[PDB]
Enzyme design. Sequence first.
Site, short mmCIF file in Angstrom:
data_model
loop_
_atom_site.label_atom_id
_atom_site.label_comp_id
_atom_site.label_asym_id
_atom_site.label_seq_id
_atom_site.Cartn_x
_atom_site.Cartn_y
_atom_site.Cartn_z
N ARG D 42 0.83 -1.19 0.00
CA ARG D 42 0.00 0.00 0.00
C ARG D 42 0.88 1.26 0.00
O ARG D 42 0.63 2.21 -0.74
CB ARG D 42 -0.98 -0.04 1.18
CG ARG D 42 -1.81 1.23 1.39
CD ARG D 42 -2.88 1.40 0.31
NE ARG D 42 -2.80 2.72 -0.29
CZ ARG D 42 -3.82 3.57 -0.31
NH1 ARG D 42 -4.96 3.22 0.24
NH2 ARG D 42 -3.72 4.75 -0.91
N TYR D 156 1.88 8.33 25.86
CA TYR D 156 2.90 7.86 24.94
C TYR D 156 3.48 6.51 25.40
O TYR D 156 4.01 5.74 24.59
CB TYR D 156 3.97 8.93 24.80
CG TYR D 156 4.81 8.83 23.56
CD1 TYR D 156 4.23 8.85 22.31
CD2 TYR D 156 6.20 8.79 23.63
CE1 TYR D 156 5.00 8.84 21.16
CE2 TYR D 156 6.98 8.78 22.50
CZ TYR D 156 6.37 8.79 21.27
OH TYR D 156 7.12 8.77 20.12
N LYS D 163 11.52 5.38 22.38
CA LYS D 163 12.24 6.56 21.91
C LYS D 163 13.50 6.85 22.75
O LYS D 163 14.48 7.38 22.20
CB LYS D 163 11.35 7.81 21.80
CG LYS D 163 10.32 7.80 20.67
CD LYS D 163 10.91 7.44 19.31
CE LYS D 163 9.81 7.32 18.25
NZ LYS D 163 10.32 7.43 16.82
N1 LIG Z 1 3.76 12.53 13.71
C1 LIG Z 1 4.35 12.88 14.84
O1 LIG Z 1 3.69 13.70 15.75
C2 LIG Z 1 5.69 12.39 15.27
C3 LIG Z 1 6.34 13.10 16.27
C4 LIG Z 1 7.61 12.72 16.69
C5 LIG Z 1 8.21 11.64 16.06
N2 LIG Z 1 7.54 10.91 15.12
C6 LIG Z 1 8.23 9.78 14.49
O2 LIG Z 1 8.33 9.99 13.10
C7 LIG Z 1 8.52 8.75 12.45
C8 LIG Z 1 7.61 8.64 11.22
O3 LIG Z 1 6.27 8.53 11.61
P1 LIG Z 1 5.13 9.51 11.04
O4 LIG Z 1 4.53 10.33 12.10
O5 LIG Z 1 5.57 10.08 9.76
O6 LIG Z 1 3.99 8.40 10.77
P2 LIG Z 1 3.71 7.46 9.48
O7 LIG Z 1 3.42 8.36 8.32
O8 LIG Z 1 2.66 6.51 9.87
O9 LIG Z 1 5.04 6.65 9.12
C9 LIG Z 1 5.45 5.54 9.87
C10 LIG Z 1 6.28 4.70 8.94
O10 LIG Z 1 6.77 3.64 9.72
C11 LIG Z 1 6.87 2.54 8.84
N3 LIG Z 1 7.07 1.25 9.52
C12 LIG Z 1 6.47 0.84 10.66
N4 LIG Z 1 6.96 -0.39 10.92
C13 LIG Z 1 7.86 -0.76 9.98
C14 LIG Z 1 8.59 -1.92 9.79
N5 LIG Z 1 8.51 -2.94 10.63
N6 LIG Z 1 9.45 -1.97 8.72
C15 LIG Z 1 9.55 -0.91 7.83
N7 LIG Z 1 8.80 0.22 8.03
C16 LIG Z 1 7.96 0.29 9.09
C17 LIG Z 1 5.55 2.60 8.07
O11 LIG Z 1 5.55 1.86 6.87
P3 LIG Z 1 4.23 1.00 6.42
O12 LIG Z 1 2.98 1.84 6.58
O13 LIG Z 1 4.46 0.61 4.97
O14 LIG Z 1 4.15 -0.24 7.28
C18 LIG Z 1 5.42 4.09 7.84
O15 LIG Z 1 5.97 4.42 6.58
C19 LIG Z 1 8.22 7.71 13.52
O16 LIG Z 1 9.44 7.23 14.02
C20 LIG Z 1 7.52 8.45 14.64
O17 LIG Z 1 7.77 7.82 15.88
C21 LIG Z 1 6.28 11.26 14.72
C1 LIG Z 2 0.53 12.27 24.09
C2 LIG Z 2 1.55 12.20 23.05
C3 LIG Z 2 1.09 12.94 21.84
C4 LIG Z 2 2.23 13.30 20.91
C5 LIG Z 2 2.79 12.12 20.13
C6 LIG Z 2 3.43 12.61 18.84
C7 LIG Z 2 3.75 11.46 17.94
C8 LIG Z 2 2.84 11.02 16.99
C9 LIG Z 2 3.05 9.85 16.28
C10 LIG Z 2 4.18 9.09 16.52
O1 LIG Z 2 4.60 8.09 15.66
C11 LIG Z 2 4.21 6.80 16.00
C12 LIG Z 2 3.36 6.61 17.08
C13 LIG Z 2 2.76 5.39 17.28
C14 LIG Z 2 3.01 4.37 16.38
N1 LIG Z 2 2.34 3.08 16.56
O2 LIG Z 2 1.42 3.01 17.37
O3 LIG Z 2 2.66 2.16 15.82
C15 LIG Z 2 3.88 4.52 15.32
C16 LIG Z 2 4.51 5.75 15.14
C17 LIG Z 2 5.12 9.52 17.46
O4 LIG Z 2 6.21 8.76 17.69
C18 LIG Z 2 4.91 10.71 18.14
#
Ligand SMILES: NC(=O)c1ccc[n+]([C@@H]2O[C@H](COP(=O)([O-])OP(=O)(O)OC[C@H]3O[C@@H](n4cnc5c(N)ncnc54)[C@H](OP(=O)(O)O)[C@@H]3O)[C@@H](O)[C@H]2O)c1
Ligand SMILES: CCCCCCc1ccc(Oc2ccc([N+](=O)[O-])cc2)c(O)c1
Lengths: 254, 254, 254, 255
Positions: D42, D156, D163
């Site tokens: 996907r 979280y 993390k």
């Molecule tokens: N959004 C936020 O508020 C936020 C804040 C701080 C940090 N982060 C970090 O940013 C990073 C990216 O996440 P995002 O927010 O951009 O969400 P996202 O768009 O859902 O991306 C998460 C990615 O993780 C990949 N993934 C999960 N398990 C995997 C595996 N076993 N092997 C290979 N790929 C895998 C998914 O690929 P598939 O869908 O193809 O499985 C997806 O492309 C994460 O590390 C998250 O913790 C996010």
């Molecule tokens: C109360 C905390 C709110 C702020 C969190 C911000 C944030 C958002 C998405 C995030 O990215 C994630 C979170 C969860 C999963 N999961 O459930 O598989 C995968 C990737 C993150 O790390 C971090």
Amino acid sequence: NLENKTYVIMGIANKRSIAFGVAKVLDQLGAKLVFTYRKERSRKELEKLLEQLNQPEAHLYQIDVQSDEEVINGFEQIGKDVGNIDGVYHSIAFANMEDLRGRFSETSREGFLLAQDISSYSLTIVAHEAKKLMPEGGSIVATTYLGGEFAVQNYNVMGVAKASLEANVKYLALDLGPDNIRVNAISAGPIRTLSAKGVGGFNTILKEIEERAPLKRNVDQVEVGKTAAYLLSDLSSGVTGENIHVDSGFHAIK
Amino acid sequence: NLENKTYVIMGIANKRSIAFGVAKVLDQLGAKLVFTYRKERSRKELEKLLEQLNQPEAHLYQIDVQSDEEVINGFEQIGKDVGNIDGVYHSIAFANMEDLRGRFSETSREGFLLAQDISSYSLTIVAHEAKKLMPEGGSIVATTYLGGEFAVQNYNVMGVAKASLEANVKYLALDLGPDNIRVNAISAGPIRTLSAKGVGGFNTILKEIEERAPLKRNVDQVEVGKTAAYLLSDLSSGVTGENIHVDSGFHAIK
Amino acid sequence: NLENKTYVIMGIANKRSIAFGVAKVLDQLGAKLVFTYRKERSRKELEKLLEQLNQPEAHLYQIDVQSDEEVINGFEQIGKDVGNIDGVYHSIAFANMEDLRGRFSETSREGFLLAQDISSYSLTIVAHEAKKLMPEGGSIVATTYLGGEFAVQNYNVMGVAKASLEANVKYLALDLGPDNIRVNAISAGPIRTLSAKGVGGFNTILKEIEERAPLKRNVDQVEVGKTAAYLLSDLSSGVTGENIHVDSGFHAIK
Amino acid sequence: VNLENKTYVIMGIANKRSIAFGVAKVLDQLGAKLVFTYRKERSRKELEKLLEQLNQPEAHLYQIDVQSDEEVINGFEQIGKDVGNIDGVYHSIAFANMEDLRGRFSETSREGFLLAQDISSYSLTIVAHEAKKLMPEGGSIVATTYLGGEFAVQNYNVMGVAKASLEANVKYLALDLGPDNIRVNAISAGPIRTLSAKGVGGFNTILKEIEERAPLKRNVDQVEVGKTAAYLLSDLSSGVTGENIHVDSGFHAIK
Ligand SMILES: NC(=O)c1ccc[n+]([C@@H]2O[C@H](COP(=O)([O-])OP(=O)(O)OC[C@H]3O[C@@H](n4cnc5c(N)ncnc54)[C@H](OP(=O)(O)O)[C@@H]3O)[C@@H](O)[C@H]2O)c1
Ligand SMILES: CCCCCCc1ccc(Oc2ccc([N+](=O)[O-])cc2)c(O)c1
Ligand SMILES: NC(=O)c1ccc[n+]([C@@H]2O[C@H](COP(=O)([O-])OP(=O)(O)OC[C@H]3O[C@@H](n4cnc5c(N)ncnc54)[C@H](OP(=O)(O)O)[C@@H]3O)[C@@H](O)[C@H]2O)c1
Ligand SMILES: NC(=O)c1ccc[n+]([C@@H]2O[C@H](COP(=O)([O-])OP(=O)(O)OC[C@H]3O[C@@H](n4cnc5c(N)ncnc54)[C@H](OP(=O)(O)O)[C@@H]3O)[C@@H](O)[C@H]2O)c1
Ligand SMILES: NC(=O)c1ccc[n+]([C@@H]2O[C@H](COP(=O)([O-])OP(=O)(O)OC[C@H]3O[C@@H](n4cnc5c(N)ncnc54)[C@H](OP(=O)(O)O)[C@@H]3O)[C@@H](O)[C@H]2O)c1
Ligand SMILES: CCCCCCc1ccc(Oc2ccc([N+](=O)[O-])cc2)c(O)c1
Ligand SMILES: CCCCCCc1ccc(Oc2ccc([N+](=O)[O-])cc2)c(O)c1
Ligand SMILES: CCCCCCc1ccc(Oc2ccc([N+](=O)[O-])cc2)c(O)c1
Ligand SMILES: N[C@@H](CCC(=O)O)C(=O)O
Ligand SMILES: N[C@@H](CCC(=O)O)C(=O)O
Ligand SMILES: N[C@@H](CCC(=O)O)C(=O)O
């Protein structure tokens, strides 16, 4: 004075173990102590070491923290044998030699998850299970190392495991706070123990504390235990999610 | 147990002072106490509160930490009257409300240096003078707040003074460690005192602690005193350069 | 790309000054540069170093940051001469050798406050005066050192000024954020400059970096300028109250 | 920061909102040749679509599930054979069961805890080991973290411990690979509306808080993470390794 307090101490291997430090201190202070060990050699050991304490009885339970069954059943038995407890001292960690001696980037998945499993997750399951025996609150302490906050050459996978443990402490502190269970870490300095022989570069690190830490000396098991007595008693009410370095001040200098 | 120990407590103003928290705990523990004060009104208060303590005599000295001569002469006088001491509890700060109530970017030079002088530099000179009364070693604890670690709305110039204090603990810990003098800080959560009244938004912060901090309640002066007893006693013998948060865990969350 | 951007750079004394590395990088990226200095001799070095810059105009202003009138009048004349500015690079500190080469516990009051005044307060007032030329927002960067975070042997009174300065950055960032003015620190590794000549044991720290820092080498003024470029520019738009270590990773190890 | 003749592997794009696609838009705009790894078909289909928005003359797409040593090993080897030596990796990958996430932290399952560590932290260690082989000359690895790695942030839960692991993993990798001139760093991103963000209890109430309380009084976006990634992945940040840059409107600095 910890009379009529009961604590569970996990991770005595022998007379040099950090948790035997904690044990002598709590024993002096009049606590009743329960002990957990992994292998029968640590038990025999433990029975002999216990003759050194004022424990009127030997409360010894096998608990390999890799088994939920063992943690769940371990604490249940303790509850039936001893009643509600006042706290737990966690002094447990493990990593492969194969992974400690390689370059950090060469760590195997298996080894990396093993260290996480024993050194960090074990505190979560122990905290969930021990909570059952602390209906009025209590205190849980784990033993970390400065290498969980900084990259310390050779500490490698264990440092990532301690970084994990140290956050585990913060999340358990937040989760268990409303139940009046405080969770804290002691970051011990380097101490000559059975496990310390498995860390490459340990002696060299002993020497550098002597030469560089503010107090210009190393620490010992008993100084860890004295701080553990503070964290486990009412003296530290109000302190949770904290990491106290018992390390001659080495954490404060660069 | 602190019998045959003597500590100096700087900065009681009234019964709500954090330092009187410390006094009650140390006094309960058998310590002999010496008290220093800036304003006459604070001595009057000290004279009244002493009636609640077990201290068989008043040892009171006027020391205004803006004056070297007063710090030097005060500590010298203390050595003549009670002999060698085992540590100092420092509970002193100040800033113009005209600075505290502004935008931080608008802080006056004279006001910024005034907060540094009394809130931080004072620890340095207290330590230098107090060391002469600790030929065998001892322990120095200063009171700080979270705002020295992070920017907290309204704490303004005092946060920068506490950041300075907190580093001053570290440089003192290093400097004086070879003399066996430990230097540590207690980071107290918010507590109703006379000085709290000059901090915009104080009550709001009180309530955010009850709601958000791990323990879901605020801390009190006695809880600071119990952690002071720990830092000031041999219980904490391997701990120096440390900052122990007595704040219901608020420091570990976000 | 910084064409049509104007930055003020404070604290070039000679070709080795950290701020001159900043200057070269920004001058190269197309920026218009405005330079402040204290000594008549820094103006002469600047006049000579401008020759190897693409600056088609010298904009040099005497500002001693001990004087409110100097900072206030100098920024007003800057605004009149070059219009609105995009950013300030702060590269200013000072402490007495007499305090530097002593035990920290022997630091003078006047030495302690001199260091706070020039090395930290200067930023608060510069930020206030330069906000007037940044009606649409901008970026403000100051130069710190790891010794504001930990007690580095021999760094003494400057460590406490740097801890102060780093809090200053966080408190300016919070105050000035709603005006879209970002405020950050670069924590530079050790670099042979004129000022480094006043710190005891600077050569032995150079050596220790090469031996111990992740990258096993020391850094230079250009490497600081390249991070200054990032922080002064829109590349860093969601970043404020930050401290970026340009130090070969040495901050990250123990 | 001009990046022609540069090549970056970007792991963890699932759609237009992914943080990694912020990173892409920025590097692609600065002239970088880009290679993309994904887990689910996907996401690859989503990648093919988003590539039309990019300048990339060709699509370089590889399926790598970081739970498998083989797929990471063969992925990178395969990468090295298609495009040659690389300049860096942007690691944007995490996972944990909703099951562990929306429950008490003390109730976290072993399997769930170890899963979070595996995908969210260990994957960095093996990617770095394998990506080093395509960096004989040096480069830059950037991972994505969240403030909940440094402080217990309510809800979280298990991801915060994961993390913390990641952030330490960055530090240990930095020390280890430093003398090979590979820099390893993290971006601590503010909350951003992404697919994964839908896993976290209380995500919307945190967005509100940032905006009321963070210095800049607004939330950040994926392009802002990208502009910092471009700095960390380029020569602008020589000198910088083992570092964690908070791209979060200053929220990390306040309490
Ligand atoms: N959004 C936020 O508020 C936020 C804040 C701080 C940090 N982060 C970090 O940013 C990073 C990216 O996440 P995002 O927010 O951009 O969400 P996202 O768009 O859902 O991306 C998460 C990615 O993780 C990949 N993934 C999960 N398990 C995997 C595996 N076993 N092997 C290979 N790929 C895998 C998914 O690929 P598939 O869908 O193809 O499985 C997806 O492309 C994460 O590390 C998250 O913790 C996010
Ligand atoms: C109360 C905390 C709110 C702020 C969190 C911000 C944030 C958002 C998405 C995030 O990215 C994630 C979170 C969860 C999963 N999961 O459930 O598989 C995968 C990737 C993150 O790390 C971090
Ligand atoms: N020594 C130091 O310089 C130092 C410094 C800082 C922190 N620490 C920490 O202090 C703690 C105690 O270690 P130590 O140095 O005192 O060495 P130690 O005496 O060898 O203790 C390690 C203990 O862990 C137990 N253990 C390992 N895996 C277990 C498992 N799966 N289930 C139950 N117990 C298990 C061992 O028991 P068995 O013998 O029965 O297998 C042993 O009792 C560890 O967390 C260590 O990381 C040590
Ligand atoms: N209340 C809180 O929530 C809180 C939280 C964290 C930290 N703290 C810290 O705790 C310490 C004590 O404060 P507090 O809240 O207990 O308030 P307090 O009862 O008002 O005490 C402040 C004390 O500082 C003394 N002082 C001020 N300037 C002095 C000077 N120039 N020379 C000698 N002494 C001087 C005052 O003496 P005089 O009245 O005689 O002038 C007073 O006794 C301070 O460092 C404060 O920053 C307070
Ligand atoms: N070199 C390093 O290893 C190192 C490491 C970390 C941080 N830093 C920081 O880098 C910054 C610049 O120092 P540097 O190492 O580049 O040495 P530098 O070349 O000697 O620069 C020091 C500058 O401070 C200026 N200055 C001092 N007092 C001033 C005052 N009262 N008013 C206005 N300007 C004043 C000096 O101007 P005049 O010559 O005209 O008096 C000089 O330009 C400082 O903040 C220092 O703390 C340096
Ligand atoms: C780079 C040298 C650092 C000095 C190490 C200080 C220290 C010593 C022992 C430590 O305890 C350990 C170490 C290893 C294992 N094991 O591999 O199973 C178990 C428990 C420790 O955490 C911490
Ligand atoms: C907005 C911050 C709310 C919590 C602040 C808690 C706190 C309360 C009292 C505190 O003590 C102070 C404050 C001010 C002064 N004064 O202006 O002279 C002297 C000592 C304090 O450090 C810290
Ligand atoms: C013992 C630590 C050795 C590394 C020091 C790194 C460093 C070098 C120069 C530094 O810059 C200054 C500027 C002025 C003054 N002074 O006037 O005394 C002192 C220092 C510095 O902050 C920091
Ligand atoms: N803003 C109010 C809040 C009341 C308080 O201090 O709690 C004040 O300045 O007084
Ligand atoms: N020791 C001399 C030179 C620097 C060094 O050799 O470390 C000084 O303190 O100025
Ligand atoms: N707790 C919400 C997340 C966002 C919110 O509404 O605060 C949920 O059930 O996902």
